[PDB]
Amino acid sequence: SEPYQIDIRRATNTDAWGPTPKHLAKVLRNRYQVPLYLMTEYTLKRLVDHIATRPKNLYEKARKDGSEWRVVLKCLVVIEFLLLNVDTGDELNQIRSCLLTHKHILTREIAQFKVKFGKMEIHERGIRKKGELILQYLEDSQFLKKERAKNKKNALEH
């Protein structure tokens, strides 16, 4: 129910469109009131809960009440945006250690991700590539550093 949770939900909804840059700006702005660790943990929880609510087979599929992949991709887009946009030191380190504490999400669940359903293969590829990128940011701090520097190039153009 917290404002930061509402902002993360909005940025990572089931709609076919977004997050917009405003949705992402809004999320980032919660860092004035909320630890990055909690923002990152919540985004990961939502990703995990949406992966787990999916039927494992056609029996279960017909018995519980195929666009859950969008929530997953959007949660990864949010994670990337934060890694690129938070402040060096405290903020970045809270994101990284939250991701490192839950590394299996990236190394296994996203790495092995299967979309269910006619564009299953492309959506699958977009999810796996995004998780590769987040992994690269964690494995190579120098690459993340330079990517963070380039991200500031046009920061006051608005």
Coordinates of N, CA, C and O in Angstrom, one line a residue:
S1 N 0.8 -1.3 0.0 CA 0.0 0.0 0.0 C 0.8 1.3 0.0 O 0.3 2.4 -0.2
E2 N 2.1 1.2 0.2 CA 3.0 2.4 0.2 C 3.1 3.1 -1.1 O 3.1 2.4 -2.2
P3 N 3.2 4.4 -1.1 CA 3.4 5.1 -2.4 C 4.4 4.5 -3.3 O 4.2 4.5 -4.6
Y4 N 5.6 4.0 -2.8 CA 6.6 3.5 -3.7 C 6.2 2.2 -4.4 O 6.6 1.9 -5.5
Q5 N 5.3 1.4 -3.7 CA 4.8 0.2 -4.2 C 3.8 0.4 -5.3 O 3.7 -0.3 -6.3
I6 N 3.0 1.5 -5.2 CA 2.1 1.9 -6.1 C 2.8 2.4 -7.4 O 2.3 2.1 -8.5
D7 N 3.9 3.1 -7.2 CA 4.7 3.6 -8.4 C 5.3 2.4 -9.1 O 5.3 2.4 -10.3
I8 N 5.9 1.5 -8.4 CA 6.5 0.3 -9.1 C 5.4 -0.6 -9.8 O 5.6 -1.0 -10.9
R9 N 4.3 -0.8 -9.1 CA 3.1 -1.5 -9.8 C 2.7 -0.8 -11.1 O 2.5 -1.4 -12.1
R10 N 2.5 0.5 -11.0 CA 2.2 1.3 -12.2 C 3.2 1.1 -13.4 O 2.8 0.9 -14.5
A11 N 4.5 1.2 -13.0 CA 5.5 1.0 -14.0 C 5.6 -0.4 -14.6 O 6.2 -0.7 -15.7
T12 N 5.1 -1.4 -13.8 CA 5.2 -2.8 -14.2 C 3.9 -3.5 -14.3 O 3.8 -4.7 -14.1
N13 N 2.8 -2.8 -14.7 CA 1.5 -3.3 -14.9 C 1.4 -4.3 -16.1 O 2.3 -4.5 -16.9
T14 N 0.2 -4.9 -16.2 CA -0.2 -5.8 -17.3 C -0.5 -5.2 -18.7 O -0.7 -5.9 -19.7
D15 N -0.6 -3.9 -18.7 CA -0.9 -3.2 -20.0 C 0.2 -3.4 -21.0 O 1.4 -3.6 -20.6
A16 N -0.1 -3.4 -22.3 CA 0.8 -3.7 -23.4 C 1.8 -2.5 -23.6 O 2.8 -2.7 -24.3
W17 N 1.6 -1.4 -23.0 CA 2.4 -0.2 -23.2 C 3.1 0.3 -21.9 O 2.6 0.3 -20.8
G18 N 4.4 0.7 -22.1 CA 5.1 1.3 -21.0 C 6.1 0.3 -20.4 O 6.3 -0.8 -20.9
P19 N 6.8 0.7 -19.3 CA 6.8 2.0 -18.6 C 7.2 3.1 -19.4 O 8.1 3.0 -20.3
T20 N 6.7 4.3 -19.2 CA 7.1 5.5 -19.9 C 8.2 6.1 -19.1 O 8.5 5.6 -18.0
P21 N 9.0 7.1 -19.7 CA 10.0 7.7 -18.8 C 9.5 8.4 -17.5 O 10.2 8.4 -16.5
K22 N 8.2 8.9 -17.6 CA 7.6 9.5 -16.4 C 7.3 8.4 -15.3 O 7.5 8.7 -14.2
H23 N 6.9 7.2 -15.8 CA 6.7 6.1 -14.8 C 8.0 5.8 -14.1 O 8.0 5.6 -12.9
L24 N 9.1 5.7 -14.8 CA 10.4 5.4 -14.3 C 10.9 6.5 -13.4 O 11.5 6.2 -12.4
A25 N 10.7 7.8 -13.9 CA 11.1 8.9 -13.0 C 10.4 8.9 -11.7 O 11.0 9.1 -10.6
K26 N 9.1 8.6 -11.7 CA 8.3 8.6 -10.5 C 8.9 7.5 -9.6 O 9.0 7.8 -8.4
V27 N 9.2 6.3 -10.1 CA 9.7 5.3 -9.2 C 11.0 5.8 -8.6 O 11.3 5.6 -7.4
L28 N 11.9 6.3 -9.4 CA 13.2 6.7 -8.9 C 13.1 7.7 -7.7 O 13.8 7.7 -6.8
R29 N 12.1 8.6 -7.9 CA 11.9 9.7 -6.9 C 11.5 9.2 -5.5 O 11.7 9.9 -4.5
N30 N 11.0 8.0 -5.3 CA 10.8 7.4 -4.0 C 12.1 7.2 -3.2 O 12.0 7.0 -2.0
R31 N 13.2 7.3 -3.8 CA 14.5 7.2 -3.1 C 14.7 8.3 -2.1 O 15.6 8.2 -1.2
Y32 N 13.9 9.4 -2.1 CA 14.0 10.4 -1.1 C 13.3 10.0 0.2 O 13.6 10.5 1.2
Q33 N 12.4 9.0 0.1 CA 11.7 8.5 1.3 C 11.9 7.1 1.7 O 11.6 6.6 2.8
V34 N 12.5 6.3 0.7 CA 12.5 4.8 0.9 C 13.9 4.3 0.4 O 14.5 4.8 -0.6
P35 N 14.5 3.4 1.2 CA 15.7 2.7 0.8 C 15.7 2.0 -0.6 O 14.7 1.3 -0.9
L36 N 16.7 2.2 -1.4 CA 16.8 1.5 -2.7 C 16.7 0.0 -2.5 O 16.2 -0.7 -3.4
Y37 N 17.0 -0.5 -1.3 CA 17.0 -2.0 -1.1 C 15.6 -2.4 -1.2 O 15.3 -3.5 -1.8
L38 N 14.7 -1.7 -0.5 CA 13.2 -2.0 -0.5 C 12.6 -1.8 -1.8 O 11.7 -2.6 -2.2
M39 N 13.0 -0.8 -2.6 CA 12.4 -0.6 -3.9 C 12.9 -1.7 -4.8 O 12.0 -2.2 -5.5
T40 N 14.1 -2.1 -4.7 CA 14.6 -3.2 -5.5 C 14.0 -4.6 -5.1 O 13.6 -5.4 -6.0
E41 N 13.9 -4.9 -3.8 CA 13.3 -6.1 -3.3 C 11.8 -6.2 -3.7 O 11.4 -7.3 -4.1
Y42 N 11.1 -5.1 -3.6 CA 9.7 -5.1 -4.1 C 9.5 -5.5 -5.6 O 8.7 -6.2 -6.0
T43 N 10.4 -4.9 -6.4 CA 10.3 -5.1 -7.9 C 10.6 -6.6 -8.1 O 9.9 -7.2 -8.9
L44 N 11.5 -7.1 -7.4 CA 11.9 -8.5 -7.5 C 10.8 -9.5 -7.1 O 10.5 -10.5 -7.7
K45 N 10.2 -9.1 -6.0 CA 9.0 -9.9 -5.4 C 7.8 -10.0 -6.4 O 7.2 -11.0 -6.5
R46 N 7.5 -8.9 -7.1 CA 6.5 -8.8 -8.1 C 6.8 -9.6 -9.3 O 6.0 -10.3 -9.8
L47 N 8.1 -9.6 -9.7 CA 8.6 -10.5 -10.8 C 8.5 -11.9 -10.4 O 7.9 -12.7 -11.1
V48 N 8.9 -12.3 -9.2 CA 8.8 -13.6 -8.6 C 7.4 -14.1 -8.5 O 7.0 -15.2 -8.8
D49 N 6.5 -13.3 -7.9 CA 5.1 -13.6 -7.7 C 4.4 -13.8 -9.1 O 3.6 -14.7 -9.3
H50 N 4.7 -13.0 -10.1 CA 4.0 -13.2 -11.4 C 4.5 -14.4 -12.2 O 3.8 -15.0 -13.0
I51 N 5.8 -14.8 -12.0 CA 6.3 -16.0 -12.6 C 5.7 -17.2 -11.9 O 5.4 -18.2 -12.6
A52 N 5.5 -17.2 -10.6 CA 4.9 -18.3 -9.8 C 3.4 -18.5 -10.0 O 2.9 -19.6 -10.0
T53 N 2.7 -17.4 -10.3 CA 1.2 -17.5 -10.6 C 0.8 -18.2 -11.9 O -0.3 -18.4 -12.2
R54 N 1.8 -18.7 -12.7 CA 1.6 -19.2 -14.0 C 1.3 -20.7 -13.9 O 2.1 -21.4 -13.3
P55 N 0.3 -21.2 -14.7 CA 0.2 -22.7 -14.8 C 1.4 -23.4 -15.2 O 2.2 -22.8 -16.1
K56 N 1.7 -24.5 -14.6 CA 2.8 -25.4 -15.0 C 2.5 -26.3 -16.2 O 3.3 -26.8 -16.9
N57 N 1.2 -26.6 -16.4 CA 0.7 -27.4 -17.5 C -0.7 -27.1 -17.9 O -1.4 -26.2 -17.2
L58 N -1.2 -27.7 -18.9 CA -2.5 -27.5 -19.5 C -3.7 -27.8 -18.5 O -4.8 -27.2 -18.6
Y59 N -3.5 -28.8 -17.6 CA -4.4 -29.2 -16.5 C -4.7 -28.0 -15.7 O -5.8 -27.6 -15.4
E60 N -3.6 -27.4 -15.1 CA -3.7 -26.2 -14.2 C -4.2 -25.0 -15.0 O -4.9 -24.2 -14.4
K61 N -3.8 -24.9 -16.2 CA -4.1 -23.7 -17.0 C -5.7 -23.6 -17.2 O -6.2 -22.5 -17.1
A62 N -6.3 -24.7 -17.5 CA -7.8 -24.8 -17.7 C -8.5 -24.6 -16.3 O -9.7 -24.4 -16.3
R63 N -7.8 -24.7 -15.2 CA -8.5 -24.7 -13.9 C -8.2 -23.5 -13.0 O -9.1 -23.2 -12.1
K64 N -7.2 -22.7 -13.2 CA -7.1 -21.4 -12.5 C -7.7 -20.3 -13.4 O -7.8 -20.5 -14.6
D65 N -8.1 -19.2 -12.8 CA -8.8 -18.1 -13.5 C -8.0 -17.6 -14.7 O -6.9 -17.0 -14.5
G66 N -1.9 -15.3 -20.9 CA -0.5 -15.5 -21.2 C 0.3 -14.2 -21.5 O 1.1 -14.1 -22.5
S67 N 0.0 -13.2 -20.7 CA 0.7 -11.9 -20.9 C 1.4 -11.5 -19.6 O 1.7 -10.4 -19.4
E68 N 1.7 -12.5 -18.7 CA 2.4 -12.3 -17.5 C 3.9 -12.0 -17.8 O 4.6 -11.4 -17.0
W69 N 4.4 -12.5 -19.0 CA 5.8 -12.1 -19.4 C 6.0 -10.6 -19.4 O 7.2 -10.2 -19.4
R70 N 5.0 -9.8 -19.6 CA 5.1 -8.3 -19.7 C 5.5 -7.8 -18.4 O 6.3 -6.8 -18.3
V71 N 4.9 -8.3 -17.3 CA 5.2 -7.8 -16.0 C 6.7 -8.2 -15.7 O 7.5 -7.4 -15.2
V72 N 7.1 -9.4 -16.1 CA 8.5 -9.8 -15.9 C 9.4 -8.9 -16.7 O 10.4 -8.4 -16.1
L73 N 9.2 -8.6 -17.9 CA 10.1 -7.7 -18.7 C 10.2 -6.3 -18.1 O 11.2 -5.7 -18.0
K74 N 9.0 -5.8 -17.7 CA 8.9 -4.5 -17.1 C 9.6 -4.4 -15.8 O 10.2 -3.3 -15.5
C75 N 9.6 -5.5 -15.0 CA 10.4 -5.5 -13.7 C 11.9 -5.4 -14.0 O 12.6 -4.7 -13.3
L76 N 12.3 -6.1 -15.1 CA 13.7 -6.0 -15.5 C 14.1 -4.7 -16.0 O 15.2 -4.2 -15.8
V77 N 13.2 -4.0 -16.8 CA 13.4 -2.7 -17.3 C 13.5 -1.7 -16.1 O 14.4 -0.8 -16.1
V78 N 12.7 -1.9 -15.0 CA 12.8 -1.1 -13.8 C 14.2 -1.3 -13.1 O 14.8 -0.3 -12.7
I79 N 14.6 -2.5 -13.0 CA 15.9 -2.8 -12.4 C 17.1 -2.2 -13.1 O 17.9 -1.5 -12.5
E80 N 17.1 -2.3 -14.4 CA 18.1 -1.6 -15.3 C 18.0 -0.1 -15.1 O 19.1 0.5 -14.9
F81 N 16.9 0.5 -15.2 CA 16.8 1.9 -15.1 C 17.4 2.4 -13.7 O 18.1 3.4 -13.7
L82 N 17.1 1.7 -12.6 CA 17.6 2.0 -11.3 C 19.1 1.9 -11.3 O 19.8 2.9 -10.8
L83 N 19.7 0.8 -11.8 CA 21.1 0.6 -11.8 C 21.8 1.8 -12.5 O 22.9 2.2 -12.1
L84 N 21.2 2.2 -13.6 CA 21.7 3.3 -14.4 C 21.5 4.7 -13.8 O 22.4 5.6 -13.9
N85 N 20.5 4.9 -13.0 CA 20.1 6.2 -12.6 C 20.3 6.6 -11.1 O 20.3 7.8 -10.8
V86 N 20.4 5.7 -10.2 CA 20.7 6.0 -8.8 C 22.0 6.7 -8.6 O 22.9 6.7 -9.5
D87 N 22.2 7.2 -7.4 CA 23.5 7.8 -7.1 C 24.5 6.7 -6.8 O 24.2 5.7 -6.2
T88 N 25.8 7.0 -7.2 CA 27.0 6.1 -6.8 C 27.1 6.1 -5.3 O 26.6 7.0 -4.6
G89 N 27.6 5.0 -4.8 CA 27.7 4.8 -3.3 C 26.5 4.1 -2.8 O 26.0 3.1 -3.4
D90 N 26.1 4.5 -1.6 CA 24.9 4.0 -0.9 C 23.8 3.4 -1.8 O 23.5 2.2 -1.7
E91 N 23.2 4.2 -2.6 CA 22.0 3.9 -3.4 C 22.3 2.7 -4.4 O 21.5 1.7 -4.3
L92 N 23.3 2.8 -5.2 CA 23.7 1.7 -6.1 C 24.1 0.5 -5.4 O 23.7 -0.6 -5.8
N93 N 24.8 0.6 -4.3 CA 25.2 -0.6 -3.5 C 24.1 -1.3 -2.9 O 24.1 -2.6 -2.9
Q94 N 23.0 -0.6 -2.5 CA 21.8 -1.3 -2.0 C 21.1 -2.1 -3.1 O 20.5 -3.2 -2.8
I95 N 21.0 -1.6 -4.3 CA 20.4 -2.3 -5.4 C 21.3 -3.6 -5.7 O 20.7 -4.6 -5.9
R96 N 22.6 -3.4 -5.8 CA 23.5 -4.5 -6.2 C 23.4 -5.6 -5.2 O 23.4 -6.8 -5.6
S97 N 23.4 -5.3 -3.9 CA 23.5 -6.3 -2.9 C 22.1 -7.0 -2.7 O 22.0 -8.2 -2.4
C98 N 21.0 -6.3 -3.0 CA 19.7 -6.9 -3.1 C 19.7 -7.9 -4.3 O 19.2 -9.0 -4.1
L99 N 20.2 -7.5 -5.4 CA 20.2 -8.4 -6.6 C 21.2 -9.6 -6.3 O 20.8 -10.7 -6.8
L100 N 22.3 -9.4 -5.7 CA 23.3 -10.4 -5.4 C 22.7 -11.4 -4.4 O 22.9 -12.6 -4.6
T101 N 22.1 -10.9 -3.4 CA 21.3 -11.8 -2.4 C 20.2 -12.6 -3.1 O 19.9 -13.7 -2.6
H102 N 19.7 -12.2 -4.2 CA 18.6 -12.9 -4.9 C 19.1 -13.3 -6.4 O 18.3 -13.4 -7.3
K103 N 20.4 -13.6 -6.5 CA 21.0 -13.9 -7.8 C 20.4 -15.0 -8.6 O 20.4 -14.8 -9.9
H104 N 19.8 -16.0 -8.0 CA 19.2 -17.1 -8.7 C 18.1 -16.7 -9.6 O 17.8 -17.4 -10.6
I105 N 17.4 -15.6 -9.3 CA 16.4 -15.0 -10.1 C 17.0 -14.7 -11.5 O 16.3 -15.0 -12.5
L106 N 18.2 -14.2 -11.5 CA 18.9 -13.9 -12.8 C 19.6 -15.0 -13.4 O 19.5 -15.3 -14.6
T107 N 20.3 -15.8 -12.6 CA 21.1 -16.9 -13.1 C 20.3 -18.1 -13.5 O 20.8 -18.9 -14.3
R108 N 19.1 -18.3 -12.9 CA 18.3 -19.4 -13.2 C 16.9 -19.1 -13.8 O 16.6 -19.5 -14.9
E109 N 16.1 -18.4 -13.0 CA 14.7 -18.2 -13.4 C 14.6 -17.3 -14.7 O 13.8 -17.6 -15.6
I110 N 15.4 -16.2 -14.8 CA 15.3 -15.4 -16.0 C 16.1 -16.1 -17.1 O 15.7 -16.2 -18.2
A111 N 17.3 -16.6 -16.8 CA 18.2 -17.3 -17.7 C 17.5 -18.5 -18.4 O 17.8 -18.8 -19.5
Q112 N 16.6 -19.2 -17.7 CA 15.9 -20.4 -18.2 C 14.4 -20.0 -18.6 O 13.6 -21.0 -18.9
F113 N 14.0 -18.8 -18.6 CA 12.6 -18.4 -18.8 C 12.0 -18.9 -20.1 O 12.5 -18.8 -21.1
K114 N 10.8 -19.4 -19.9 CA 9.9 -19.9 -21.0 C 8.6 -19.2 -21.0 O 7.9 -19.2 -20.0
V115 N 8.2 -18.5 -22.1 CA 6.9 -17.9 -22.2 C 5.9 -19.0 -22.7 O 6.2 -19.8 -23.5
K116 N 4.6 -18.9 -22.3 CA 3.7 -20.0 -22.3 C 2.9 -20.3 -23.6 O 2.9 -21.4 -24.1
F117 N 2.2 -19.3 -24.1 CA 1.1 -19.4 -25.1 C 1.2 -20.8 -25.8 O 2.1 -21.2 -26.4
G118 N 1.0 -14.9 -31.4 CA 1.9 -16.0 -31.6 C 3.3 -15.7 -31.5 O 4.1 -16.2 -32.4
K119 N 3.7 -14.9 -30.6 CA 5.1 -14.3 -30.5 C 5.9 -14.8 -29.3 O 6.7 -14.0 -28.7
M120 N 5.7 -16.0 -28.9 CA 6.3 -16.6 -27.7 C 7.9 -16.4 -27.8 O 8.5 -16.1 -26.8
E121 N 8.4 -16.8 -28.9 CA 9.9 -16.8 -29.1 C 10.5 -15.4 -28.9 O 11.6 -15.3 -28.3
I122 N 9.9 -14.4 -29.5 CA 10.5 -13.0 -29.4 C 10.4 -12.4 -28.0 O 11.3 -11.8 -27.5
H123 N 9.3 -12.6 -27.3 CA 9.1 -12.1 -25.9 C 10.0 -12.9 -25.0 O 10.6 -12.2 -24.1
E124 N 10.2 -14.2 -25.2 CA 11.2 -15.0 -24.5 C 12.6 -14.4 -24.6 O 13.3 -14.3 -23.6
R125 N 13.0 -14.1 -25.8 CA 14.3 -13.5 -26.1 C 14.5 -12.1 -25.5 O 15.6 -11.8 -25.0
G126 N 13.5 -11.2 -25.5 CA 13.6 -9.9 -24.9 C 13.8 -10.1 -23.4 O 14.5 -9.3 -22.8
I127 N 13.1 -11.0 -22.7 CA 13.3 -11.3 -21.3 C 14.7 -11.8 -21.0 O 15.4 -11.2 -20.1
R128 N 15.2 -12.8 -21.7 CA 16.5 -13.3 -21.5 C 17.6 -12.4 -21.8 O 18.5 -12.3 -21.0
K129 N 17.5 -11.6 -22.8 CA 18.5 -10.5 -23.1 C 18.5 -9.5 -22.0 O 19.6 -9.0 -21.6
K130 N 17.4 -9.0 -21.5 CA 17.4 -8.0 -20.5 C 18.1 -8.5 -19.2 O 18.9 -7.8 -18.6
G131 N 17.9 -9.8 -18.8 CA 18.5 -10.4 -17.7 C 20.0 -10.6 -17.9 O 20.7 -10.5 -16.9
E132 N 20.4 -10.8 -19.1 CA 21.8 -10.9 -19.5 C 22.5 -9.6 -19.2 O 23.6 -9.5 -18.7
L133 N 21.8 -8.5 -19.6 CA 22.3 -7.1 -19.4 C 22.5 -6.8 -17.9 O 23.5 -6.2 -17.5
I134 N 21.5 -7.1 -17.1 CA 21.6 -6.9 -15.7 C 22.7 -7.7 -15.1 O 23.5 -7.2 -14.4
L135 N 22.9 -8.9 -15.6 CA 24.0 -9.7 -15.1 C 25.4 -9.1 -15.5 O 26.3 -9.1 -14.7
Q136 N 25.5 -8.6 -16.7 CA 26.7 -7.9 -17.1 C 27.0 -6.7 -16.2 O 28.2 -6.5 -15.9
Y137 N 26.0 -6.0 -15.9 CA 26.2 -4.8 -15.0 C 26.7 -5.2 -13.6 O 27.5 -4.5 -13.0
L138 N 26.3 -6.4 -13.1 CA 26.8 -6.9 -11.8 C 28.1 -7.5 -11.9 O 28.9 -7.4 -11.0
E139 N 28.4 -8.2 -13.0 CA 29.7 -8.9 -13.1 C 30.9 -8.0 -13.5 O 32.0 -8.3 -13.1
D140 N 30.6 -6.9 -14.2 CA 31.6 -5.9 -14.6 C 31.2 -4.5 -14.2 O 30.5 -3.8 -14.8
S141 N 31.8 -4.1 -13.0 CA 31.5 -2.8 -12.5 C 32.0 -1.7 -13.4 O 31.4 -0.6 -13.4
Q142 N 33.1 -1.9 -14.1 CA 33.7 -0.9 -15.0 C 32.7 -0.6 -16.1 O 32.6 0.5 -16.5
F143 N 32.1 -1.7 -16.7 CA 31.1 -1.5 -17.7 C 29.9 -0.7 -17.2 O 29.4 0.2 -17.8
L144 N 29.4 -1.0 -16.0 CA 28.3 -0.3 -15.3 C 28.7 1.2 -15.1 O 27.9 2.1 -15.4
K145 N 29.9 1.4 -14.6 CA 30.4 2.7 -14.3 C 30.4 3.6 -15.6 O 29.9 4.7 -15.5
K146 N 30.9 3.1 -16.7 CA 30.9 3.8 -17.9 C 29.5 4.0 -18.5 O 29.2 5.1 -19.0
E147 N 28.7 3.0 -18.4 CA 27.3 3.1 -18.8 C 26.5 4.2 -18.0 O 25.7 4.9 -18.5
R148 N 26.8 4.3 -16.7 CA 26.3 5.3 -15.8 C 26.7 6.7 -16.2 O 26.0 7.6 -16.1
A149 N 28.0 6.8 -16.6 CA 28.5 8.1 -17.0 C 27.8 8.5 -18.3 O 27.4 9.7 -18.4
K150 N 27.7 7.6 -19.3 CA 27.0 8.0 -20.6 C 25.6 8.3 -20.4 O 25.0 9.1 -21.1
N151 N 24.9 7.7 -19.4 CA 23.5 8.0 -19.1 C 23.3 9.4 -18.6 O 22.2 9.9 -18.7
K152 N 24.4 10.0 -18.1 CA 24.2 11.4 -17.7 C 24.4 12.5 -18.8 O 24.1 13.6 -18.5
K153 N 24.8 12.0 -20.0 CA 25.1 12.9 -21.1 C 24.1 14.0 -21.3 O 24.4 15.2 -21.5
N154 N 22.8 13.7 -21.4 CA 21.7 14.6 -21.6 C 20.7 14.7 -20.4 O 19.5 14.8 -20.6
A155 N 21.3 14.8 -19.2 CA 20.4 14.8 -18.0 C 19.6 16.0 -17.7 O 18.6 16.0 -17.0
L156 N 20.1 17.2 -18.1 CA 19.5 18.5 -17.9 C 18.8 19.0 -19.2 O 18.6 20.2 -19.3
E157 N 18.4 18.1 -20.1 CA 17.7 18.5 -21.2 C 16.2 18.1 -21.1 O 15.8 17.0 -21.3
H158 N 15.4 19.1 -20.7 CA 14.0 18.9 -20.4 C 13.3 20.3 -20.1 O 13.0 20.6 -19.0

